[PDB]
């Protein structure tokens, strides 16, 4: 799981829950 709010970048999406936008999850 990855904590939203953090450096997620839409190409490679493991989130705990939420859409990865550039920069956030």
Same mark, same amino acid.
């Given at each position: 799981c &990855? $904590? $939203? +709010? &953090?450096?997620?970048? !839409?190409? $490679?999406?493991?989130?705990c829950? +939420? =859409?990865? !936008? =550039?920069g &956030?999850?």
């Amino acid at each position: 799981c &990855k $904590a $939203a +709010g &953090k450096p997620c970048s !839409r190409i $490679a999406y493991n989130c705990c829950t +939420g =859409s990865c !936008r =550039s920069g &956030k999850c």
